[PDB]
Amino acid sequence: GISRDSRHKRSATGAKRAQFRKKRKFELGRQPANTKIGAKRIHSVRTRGGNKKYRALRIETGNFSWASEGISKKTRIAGVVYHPSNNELVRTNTLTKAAIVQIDATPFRQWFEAHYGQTLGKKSKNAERKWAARAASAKIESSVESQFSAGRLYACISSRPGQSGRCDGYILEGEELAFYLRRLTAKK
Amino acid sequence: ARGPKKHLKRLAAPHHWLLDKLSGCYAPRPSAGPHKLRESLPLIVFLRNRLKYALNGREVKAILMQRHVKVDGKVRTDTTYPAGFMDVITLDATNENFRLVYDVKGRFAVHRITDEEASYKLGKVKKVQLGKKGVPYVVTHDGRTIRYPDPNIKVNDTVKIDLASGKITDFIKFDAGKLVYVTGGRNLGRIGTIVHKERHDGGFDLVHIKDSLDNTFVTRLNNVFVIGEQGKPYISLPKGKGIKLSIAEERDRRRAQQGL
Amino acid sequence: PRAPRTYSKTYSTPKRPYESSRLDAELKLAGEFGLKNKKEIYRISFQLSKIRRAARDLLTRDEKDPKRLFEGNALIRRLVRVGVLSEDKKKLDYVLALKVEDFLERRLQTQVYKLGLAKSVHHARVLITQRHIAVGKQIVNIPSFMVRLDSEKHIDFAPTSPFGGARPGRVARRNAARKAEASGE
Amino acid sequence: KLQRKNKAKQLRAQRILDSIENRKLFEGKNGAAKIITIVPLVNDLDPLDILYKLLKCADDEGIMVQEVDSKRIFNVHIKKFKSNLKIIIPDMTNFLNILDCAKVADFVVFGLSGVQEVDEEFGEQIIRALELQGIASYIGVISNLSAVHEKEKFQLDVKQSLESYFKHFFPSEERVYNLEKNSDALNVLRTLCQRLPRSINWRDNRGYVVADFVDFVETSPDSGDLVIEGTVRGIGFNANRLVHIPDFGDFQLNKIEKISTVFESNMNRDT
RNA sequence: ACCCACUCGGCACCUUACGAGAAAUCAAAGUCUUUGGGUUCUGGGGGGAGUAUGGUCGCAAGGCUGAAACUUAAAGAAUUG
RNA sequence: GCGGUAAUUCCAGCUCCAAUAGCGUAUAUUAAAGUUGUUGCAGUUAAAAAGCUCGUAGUUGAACUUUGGGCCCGGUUAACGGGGCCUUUCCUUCUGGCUAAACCAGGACUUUUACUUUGAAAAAAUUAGAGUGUUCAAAGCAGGCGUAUUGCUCGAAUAUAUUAGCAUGGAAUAAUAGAAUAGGACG
RNA sequence: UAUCUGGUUGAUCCUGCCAGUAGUCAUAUGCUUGUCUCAAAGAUUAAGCCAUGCAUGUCUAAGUAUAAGCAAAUACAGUGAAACUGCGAAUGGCUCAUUAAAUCAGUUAUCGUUUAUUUGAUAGUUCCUCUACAUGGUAUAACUGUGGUAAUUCUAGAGCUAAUACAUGCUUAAAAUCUCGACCCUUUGGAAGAGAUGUAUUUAUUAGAUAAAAAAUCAAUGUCUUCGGACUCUUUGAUGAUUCAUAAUAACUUUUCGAAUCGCAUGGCCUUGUGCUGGCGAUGGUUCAUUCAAAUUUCUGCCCUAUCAACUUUCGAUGGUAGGAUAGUGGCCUACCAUGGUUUCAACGGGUAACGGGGAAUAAGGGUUCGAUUCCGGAGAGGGAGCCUGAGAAACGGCUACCACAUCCAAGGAAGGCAGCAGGCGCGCAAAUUACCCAAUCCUAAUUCAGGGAGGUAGUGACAAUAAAUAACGAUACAGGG
């Protein structure tokens, strides 16, 4: 079907090769999986060597990570806002590795309330000592607070959906976040 | 060709098996095991072409299924079990123990060893790593992986496994001045001391070895197996003490032990 | 799939086939030593040329090369063990100096001529063919046996073969039977 | 290269298509009278044993068992080679019956014995007579070679002696088979099933019918009609032409029915 | 301007064979079976044939490049009549 | 009857020669062939020097830079080859001891190459070749010797593989780079 | 180991080609044919077409036994047809059509990957803040019985019953460390009890130091002295090289694994319970290593051709970024953006009656010619393509579809792949038996046992090669050298 061998393309000199053999199996390729947004629907695929690649066809509520506090929460995915490679996947909301998506906010803000105690967008003396020990570290930059006030964050998917099923990622921080806002506001 | 190969024709066997080119058109092809097939000796060849105890395939088969041949203290019932270098295979029914070691000419030779000192086996530790769950382990030339080694044991050294469960006894460091035996190449079967080791980053550090009669040679590090220090190797050497004398004095020795 | 069996032809035809001189020499050799055809002369000349090529390209080798010493000693040793070279000619220029005749002299047919016992060279050939002579103990019927030196003194009549006793042959048996049935009664 | 290959293919197809319309003309398989007659040449020989050896190697015991009881003309259908064999054993006491059976047949098989030599008064005259009267395809075979000493060297000496005898009599064929060995029995069977018979000029230019059902119906008190169900081979018959029946004479045909049309003899009857 | 001697670079010549060559002849056609200073081009018996085809140059005439099937035992230097 | 008979012998026999359980023929190829020529062809007249000159790639390209002398020692049969010292001469990237930047013990050491020596790593069969009486031989890798009553035992070598890649000694031969705006070395 | 001789020849000499000579492990053919050892053989033309038969099955003490099978422990127990299950069927064998930087040869790389098996290591954590574990449940084949079809190794509905089948499912220690904290008692504050802590997956982050020595700072600030404040061993492997091996934290998962299996043995303990505990194995299982391999890969090397000089990029040609896919790198594919890459040192195109190499013939050396073929590597099963199962296939003695042939008939439908072994037709100058056997060499399987046209033996056989019978000795009479 889909071939990966280097024998159907021209050589470095423009020389046209000839068919050395039929299409072998150990160089096969498989059909793409344009994974959409919806309820979870996953098909498994048997691979060379007898392993499995969990092809995710529809997925939501993936894992996402905050690097600075280093936490990870299972969160819904509102949808793709920017894709670096192709533009049509933004229109049809197709997930890939390294994709700029918009996700919901709430598990992060409940963790922040339970962990630091301060509020964004506007008893228990042991927990008071916990907050005092965790004080003088509650400052984050302005744009993440503005997103928390909005209720949706900009994250980047850094996991392969069609190769392992999961749709994992990290929320943007700093220079990455600034560059992606600049590109998003310049294009859109 | 669509899968692994299971047959081995004659005129594709190792030459040190000493297989006759007539009397059949096929060779054993040892199955997977401790050694690669090009450096291995199947039990069928060892028991019908070296000892002449068997006569054919079915007699050595009846030997093996009668549970009399043990490789490394374990009973093996394959005719094509690849017995290789520094194996201590035993025949308990007749009370001899054998050790496989290259002769002076480069072929696997019979070498009778006692009840004692058949209780160990040397092994070139080939690569050391740190396994899963933090445990450190070594693996030698015959696939044996031994956990919790002595920390001074590094890559390309010699350990001394006894028989039972690994349990590495006193080992040998790799440095100049040690008795060294050869397991590959043109100088296959000579013994000697390292006089120097040359280092070449990128590939194949070489070793300069001088034997007991001041005949020096150079070999790649993959064919180097240090067996001890000067004067007292820990194993019993084969006949001729691994010297590789030239043809003229070999013919002189033929004319010396000729007659009576 | 069985390994090929190796073989080699052991004679060679002359390039110039037809001239008077060597034809005269070959017919002379056949007359003196009892030869069936010209294959025997070609065989001895071929093995002699092989020997001389070996002696020659060891002679082009420099002195005290161990290969030259070893192979020269082996070649001289085999050609004195056959008995063609004399004892006092163990040199490479001397092994270059051989002929066809002294190779043909060391054959068994010529030797069973020379030790008595045959009284004619063609009688020697037909009586060596006919299974009458044991070298050592073993009965041999090959005229081109190339007798060595250590087996030179053992050429005797066989334990079979009525020339060495042991139940006289077929024609004598039938003659005795005829004279028994006729002149007996 | 491809133009060369096409030129070769086109010329080869031309050659084959030229060579096809010479051999394709026959039909057999589903229905064919490829008659085999078994002719012994030694009095101490049983042709029923020959037919037993022949039918044993098609793995069909029931046909031979049904042939054991009382029959001499056999319709055996082979499913291995898918061939309709008709086996006829002539009467050895009627030599003219042997001549008629051989002159109607397409295949004849000669049974030869390895113990008793061929009689110069019994079998040799049969061989000469069948040669002279017109002979179709023939196969010679040995049956009693087991009655010879058990060792194969003597038996093959006998086999080559009778091969020499047959090639003095018939040099066109050279190998005489053994029915003790199953292999040559199978070779005989495939030869009988597959190989096309040659033609005998006199019998195939006037037609011949081998009959199975010949019964009588009443037409007149002085003469009536016999009913011959039969296989027609050769040239075919005409309603007006006369027909000869051996040991009966010449008669006029009256009616023809074709089962696989109705033909009645008109005023053009030969008197 | 002429004469004598010398020298460089030429166009040519007479003799010779130290050498070369099949011979006529050659100060090069010498330093070559004792065969190697550097480097371009061309030829492989005679016909078919400088034909046929292709390409290219040319307004034309024509030029440059250029085979094969087939066939055949043949096709320079002197002396002597 | 003789002789001649583009009878290119028109047909048969006798004798002789060569090879011989084999011999001839056809085709293809190799050698003798120096008619493919690198070793090793030829070009005045026998085939063959462009009509002539310039010129790109290609091939080829003047000479010159550590010579010579003395010292010892040991290797091989008075000769041959070797290594260190001195003679303005051991020139480079770094550790540990003697010290007052310089000695000793140590890993490497081509400005970039070509060349050449030694070595590694180089499948078996085949090739050359050592041994061994398959009865000889082509072969095969066997075998040989004994109280032949519980046996002993040699051996299954060696050599080659011109290329490309790897390591190593040499520095003749043939190349390249270095300080002319000193933008240079050495502390 | 290095010889020549005739044709132009009329009287001569050289150039020149032809003819003669010899060899071929080089094919055929003509004639003849006694012996011994040895053995190539439908490659050239047609990788053309195939009747018939064999060529792949497999059970040990160790998965399933109610055969109304054969024989001889009241659950079974000997042997064992059938069938489910597991493994193999991807090795062999054949052929040389394609293939001209493709295969191949030697040499490397995988710090860029897959790997059934063999061998060595390797799993106290599972439901759980109300539970079968001295053992959960469903079906189905084989079988009984009824049938359809002309046919095929075609099968339907009906009734039974098992697993190492399919589907679920708890055991197990103690310690330690973290998050949440009833809090209390008032502080330099310190505390009951709740949860979590195997492996595998995916993501984010952190540790994975190390060329030799001297002070002042603050913050996180820990133990101890003598609360002045002092402070010490502190722990890190390999490689030439790593974001390596590995560890730790936060989570995630249609939660992968963590023994509901089988044989042979009756050991030990006493509370004497049909209690506790216990051997020798076979079979499975996660991860890593080893081994059999596999796939991509660096360097250098090919036959003839200029009557092939420019070629590659619509429709990827060269590179960059990111993505998809793959076992994995990679224009292998897609989006975007650059305008590149090869070439007289002959690119690209064409021819090959071209598989490549180890090798073979020819012996002065150098070379010329051949290699379809006993070994190694590649490709293919009439031409293409796609694919299921599986560790491994783009398999063809597997399937599907089209194409070209072509078979059976009840005219409705079904079955096909000899470039495997024999053999047949055809093509030809050109090539053997429809034989015997697993005894040797070895392969496959549940495995000493069965199977193997792999292979061996024999038949045909003047391919080629070795050894040497067809006569030997007298006497007589002559002829001699005498």
- The label of the residue with tokens 């394959």 reads B78
Q: Give the Cα separation of B6 and A87 in Å (integer).
A: 53
Minimal CA separation from C4 to chain B, in Å: 9
Alpha carbons D36 and D210: distance in angstroms, whole number = 12
How many domains would you assign to chain C?
A: 1
As a whole number of angstroms, the distance between CA C125 and CA C133 comes to: 11
Domain presence at residue C7 = no
SS3 A147: helix
State the Cα–Cα distance between residues B235 and B191, nearest whole angstrom. Answer: 12
Do the Cβ atoms of D26 and D196 come closer than 8 Å? yes
CATH of the domain at B212: 2.30.30.30
First to last CA, chain C: 70
Q: How far is the CA of B237 from the C1' of E61 (A)?
A: 99
Clarify whether residues A37 and A101 are in a common domain.
yes
- CA angle at A22 for the pair A16 and A28, rounded to the nearest 5°: 95
Structure tokens at D223: 């003469």
Quote the distance between the C-alpha of residue D64 and its chain's center. Answer: 18
Same domain, yes or no, for B142 and B164?
yes
Q: Which of B245, B247, B254 to mutate to test the interface with C (most CBs of C within 10 A)?
A: B247
Amino acid identity of D221?
Answer: P
Q: H/E element holding D195? A: none
Determine the Cα–Cα distance for residues B210 and B218; give it in Å rounded to an integer.
9
CATH number for the domain including B133?
A: 2.40.50.740
Helix pair C39-59, C66-82: axis angle to 10 deg: 150
Q: Does C1 touch chain B (CB under 8 A)?
A: yes
Nearest to C1 by CA among D201, A118, B26: B26
- Helix, coil or strand: residue A111: helix
Nearest one of B13, B27, B36 to B84, comparing CA atoms: B36
Separation of CA A13 and C1' G318 in angstroms? 10
Q: Do the beta carbons of residue A184 and residue A82 sit within 8 Å?
A: yes
Is residue C71 a part of any domain in this protein?
A: yes
Q: Which residue is nearest to nucleotide G292 (CA to C1')?
A: B32
CB contact under 8 A, C3 and B10: yes
Distance CA D110, CA D177 (A): 10
Q: For residue C147, count CB atoms less than 10 angstroms from its CB and return exposed for 0-12, middle for 13-18, buried for 19 or more.
A: buried
Name the 3-class secondary structure at D59: coil
Order the strands of the B121-130 sheet from edge to edge. Answer: B145-147, B136-140, B121-130, B157-161
- Who's near A58: CB < 8 A, 6+ residues apart? A35, A36, A37, A38, A39, A40, A41
If asked whether residues B17 and B103 sit together in one domain, one would say yes
Same domain, A45 and A61: yes
Rg of chain D over all Cα atoms, to the nearest angstrom: 22
| A131/D120 Cα distance (integer angstroms) | 133
Which positions 54-73 of C are in contact with B (Cβ < 8 Å)? 66, 69-70
CA of A83 to C1' of G294 (A): 38
> Is residue D12's beta carbon less than 7 angstroms from any atom in nucleic acid strand G?
yes
Same domain, B178 and B163: no
Q: Is residue C139 part of a domain?
A: yes
Number of domains in chain B: 3
Q: Do A139 and A184 fall within a single domain? A: no
**End-to-end CA separation in angstroms for chain B:** 58
Residue C2 near chain B (CB below 8 Å):
yes
Q: CA(A38)–C1'(G138) in Å?
A: 35
Q: From CA C108, how far away is CA C135, in angstroms rounded? A: 10
CA–CA separation, B174 and B154 (whole Å): 9
B137 shares a domain with B221: no
d(CA C63, CA C2): 44
- CA of B27, closest CA in chain C: separation in Å? 12
Check: CB of residue A108 under 8 Å from CB of residue A65.
Answer: no
Does the distance separating the beta carbons of B22 and C70 come in below 8 Å?
A: no
CB of A185 closer than 8 Å to CB of A143: no
Domain that residue B229 falls in? 174-244
Cα A109 to Cα A50, A125, B96, D135: the distances in Å are: 43, 22, 78, 112
CA distance D203 to D189: 25
Q: Max CA-CA distance within chain C?
A: 85
Token pair in block for residue D46: 């049983």
SS (H, E, C) chain B: CCCCCCCEECCCCCHHHCCCCCCCCEECCCCCCCCCHHHCEEHHHHHHCCCCCCCCHHHHHHHHCCCCEEECCEECCCCCCEECCCCCCEECCCCEEECCEECCCCCEECCEECCCCCCCEEEEEEEEEECHHHCEEEEECCCCEEECCCCCCCCCEEEEECCCCCCCCCCECCCCCEEEEECCCCCCCCEEEEEEEECCCCCCCEEEEECCCCCEEEEEHHHEEEEEECCCCCCCCCHHHCCCCCHHHHHHHHHHCCCC
Residues A93 and A58 in one domain: yes
Phi and psi at C90, nearest 5°, equal: -90, 65
Report which of residues 5-34 in chain C place their beta carbon less than 7 angstroms from any atom of strand F.
5-8, 10, 17-18, 23, 26-27
Domain hosting residue A135, numbered range:
106-151
- Take residue A51 and report the two structure tokens written for it: 């392993």
- Domain match, A41 and A119 both: no
Same domain, B103 and B24: yes
Distance CA C159, CA B224 (A): 62
Phi, psi of D99 (to 5 degrees): -60, -45
Contact present, B129 and B149 (Cβ < 8 Å): no
Dihedral over alpha carbons A158, A161, A164, A170 (to 10 degrees): 20
Give the residue among B91, B76, B94 at the shortest CA–CA distance from B33: B76
Cβ pair C3:B248 closer than 8 A: no
Phi, psi at D250, each rounded to 5°: -100, 135
Number of domains chain A is built from: 3
**Residue (of D146, D85, D71) closest to D114 by Cα position:** D146
Residue B96 sits in the same domain as residue B157:
no
Q: Is C149 on the interface with B (CB under 8 A)?
A: no
Dump the DSSP string for D72-99.
Answer: SEEEEEETTTTEEEEEE---TT-HHHHH
Q: Which helix (H) or strand (E) holds A58?
A: strand A52-58
The packing angle between helices A175-187 and A142-150, to 10°, is 60
Experimental method: cryo-EM
Token pair 């009965």 in the structure block, residue? C139
- What CATH number should be reported for the domain holding residue A126? 1.10.168.20
**Whether B25 and C69 lie within 8 Å, measured CB to CB:** no
Chain B adjacent subunits, 3+ CB pairs under 8 A: C
Residue B153, in any domain of the structure: yes
What range defines the domain where residue C34 resides? Answer: 17-185
The answer to whether the Cβ–Cβ distance between B22 and C1 falls below 8 Å is no
- Using CA atoms, how far residue B154 sits from B35, B173, C7, C178, D60, in Å, is 22, 8, 55, 99, 79
Find and list the nucleotides of strand G having atoms within 7 Å of a protein beta carbon: 1, 3, 21-25, 38-40, 45-46, 51-53, 89-94, 98-103, 108-109, 114-122, 180-185, 189-191, 199-205, 221, 237-240, 245-247, 249-254, 287-297, 311-312, 316-318, 321-335, 341-342, 347-349, 351-353, 358, 363, 374-381, 384-387, 389-396, 408-409, 426-428, 433-436, 439-444, 448-449, 454-456, 464-474
Residue B220 lies in a domain: yes
Tell whether A78 and A165 lie within a shared domain: yes
User: Residue B79 to residues B8, B76, B84, C19: CA-CA distances in angstroms?
Assistant: 14, 9, 14, 66
Give this entry's resolution in angstroms: 3.7
Residue B201: what are its φ and ψ, rounded to 5°? -70, 140
Residue owning tokens 């080798």: C61
Same domain, A100 and A112: no
Same-domain status, B7 and B109? yes
Q: Which helix (H) or strand (E) holds A134?
A: none
Instruction: Select from B21, B22, B247 the Cβ nearest to the Cβ of C70.
Output: B247
Dihedral sign (CA B147, B152, B153, B158): negative
Identify whether the C-beta of residue D81 lies closer than 8 Å to the C-beta of residue D75: no
- Among residues A179, A158, A9, A21, which one has the least CA distance to residue A96? A158
- Assess whether B77 and B7 both reside in one domain: yes
Please choose, from the candidates B169, B162, B86, B89, the residue with its C-alpha nearest in 3D space to the C-alpha of residue B124: B86
The answer to whether C182 faces chain B, any CB pair under 8 Å, is: no
Cα D186 from Cα D55, distance rounded (Å): 10
3-class DSSP state of D179: coil
**CATH at B59:** 3.10.290.10
Instruction: Identify whether B222 is part of a domain.
Output: yes
User: Is residue C3, in this structure, part of any structural domain at all?
Assistant: no
Decide: CB of A130 under 7 A of nucleic strand G.
Answer: yes
Chain-chain contact of B25 with C66 (C-beta, under 8 angstroms):
no
For strand F, give the nucleotides within 7 A of a protein CB: 18-21, 107-108, 119-133, 135-142, 154-159, 166-167
Assign 3-class secondary structure to D212-269: EEEEEECCCCCCCEEEEEEEEECCCCCCCCEEEECCCEEEECCEEECCCCEEECCCCC
CA A124 to chain centre: 38
Exposure string for D187-199, b = 16+ CB within 10 A, e = fewer? bbbeebbeeebee
Distance from CA of B24 to the nearest CA of C (A): 7
Using CB atoms, which residue from B21, B246, B247 is nearest to C3?
B21
Question: Residue B254 falls within a domain, yes or no?
Answer: no
Tokens of residue C18, six digits: 């037809």
Judgement on whether residues A87 and A158 belong to the same structural domain of the protein: yes
- Which residues 6+ apart lie within 8 Å of C137 measured at CB? C159
CA A164 to chain centre: 13
Classified as helix, coil or strand, A41 is strand
Is A26 in the same domain as A36? no
Query: Which of B21, B23, B245 to probe the C interface (max C CBs under 10 A)?
Result: B21
Residues 44-103 of A with CB under 7 A from strand G: 45-51, 53-55, 61-63, 65, 67, 70-74, 84-87, 96-98
d(CA C166, CA D236): 84
Q: Do chains A and D touch (3 or more CB pairs under 8 A)?
A: no
A46 and A124, same domain (yes or no)? no
Of C2, C5, C69, the CB nearest to B25: C2
B144: nearest Cα among B87, B210, B75, B62: B87
Evaluate whether chains C and B are touching (3 or more beta carbon pairs less than 8 Å apart): yes
Nearest CB partner across the interface for B248, out of C1, C3, C66: C66
Clarify whether residues A92 and A120 are in a common domain: no
- State which of B171, B190, B211 marks the end of a domain: B171
Q: Mark whether B39 and B110 lie in a shared domain.
A: yes
CA dihedral C162, C168, C169, C170 (to 10 degrees): 180
Q: Half-sphere exposure of residue D256, counting CA atoms within 13 Å on the CB side?
A: 18
Is A50 in the same domain as A126?
no
Give the separation between CA C40 and CA D256, rounded to whole angstroms. Answer: 86
**Which residues partner with B8 through β-bridges?**
B27
Using an 8 Å CB-CB cutoff, list residues of chain B that contact chain C: 9-11, 21-22, 25, 246-248, 251
Strands B206-210 and B191-198: antiparallel
Helix (H, G, I), strand (E, B) or coil at A46: strand
Token pair 């506007």 in the structure block, residue: A122
DSSP 8-state assignment for residue D122: T
Q: What are phi and psi of C168, to 5 degrees?
A: -45, 155
Cα–Cα distance between A38 and A78 in angstroms, integer? 10
Q: What is the 3-state secondary structure (H, E, C) of chain C?
A: CCCCCCCCCCCCCCCCCCCHHHHHHHHHHHHHHCCCCCHHHHHHHHHHHHHHHHHHHHHCCCCCCHHHHHHHHHHHHHHHHHCCCCCCCCCHHHHCCCCCHHHHHCCHHHHHHHCCCCCCHHHHHHHHCCCCEEECCEEECCCCCCCCCCCHHHEEECCCCHHHCCCCCHHHHHHHHHHHHHCCC
The separation, in Å, between residue B202 CA and nucleotide G111 C1' comes to: 13
CA pair distance D65, D63, nearest whole angstrom: 5
- Among B130, B149, B171, where does a domain finish? B171
d(C-alpha D64, C-alpha B166), whole Å: 75
Q: Which chains touch C (3 or more CB pairs under 8 A)?
A: B
- CA-CA distance, A59 to A180, in Å (whole number)? 24
Is the Cβ–Cβ distance between A153 and A147 less than 8 Å?
Answer: yes
Residues whose CB falls within 8 Å of the CB of residue A105, separated by 6 or more in sequence, listed in order: A147, A148, A150, A151, A152, A153
Q: Which residues pair with B42 in a beta bridge?
A: B82
Q: How far is the C-alpha of C34 from the C-alpha of C114, rounded, in Å?
A: 13
Residue B80 neighbours by CB under 8 Å, 6+ apart: B28, B29, B30, B31, B42, B43, B44
Distance in angstroms: CA B241, C1' G291: 31
Same domain as B2, residue B86: yes
